[PDB]
């Protein structure tokens, strides 16, 4: 669904964008991984009543057999199917995906 695909942005910049106080918990973006070539990253804003605003990063790996996954047991045939899925069920993530990060 493209608006949430931010491509080549750094971890630092994704955190700057996501840690905007006005974003609801579960605001997210998908970007390329800086450190693991060929992997993507799902970056999500989260709240802890201790840490407060913070961002969790979930590496999205590509199976050679083709699929995408964050945890081994749940694989997806595309990034857009993975985003639709975690927008409905948190299923291991800190929180379900809610808003697409602005811009």
């Amino acid at each position: 669904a493209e608006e949430w695909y931010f491509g080549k942005i750094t971890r630092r910049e994704s955190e700057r964008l996501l840690l905007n106080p006005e974003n609801p918990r579960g605001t997210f973006l998908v970007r390329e991984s800086e450190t693991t070539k060929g992997a993507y990253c799902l970056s999500v804003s989260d709240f802890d009543n201790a840490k407060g605003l913070n961002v969790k990063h979930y590496k999205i790996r590509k199976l050679d057999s083709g699929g995408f996954y964050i945890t081994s047991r749940t694989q997806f045939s595309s990034l857009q199917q993975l985003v639709a899925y975690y927008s409905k069920h948190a299923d291991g993530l800190c929180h379900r995906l809610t808003n697409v990060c602005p811009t």
Partner: peptide, 5 residues
């Protein structure tokens, strides 16, 4: 990154 298996 959250270390996920």
């Amino acid at each position: 990154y959250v270390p996920m298996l």
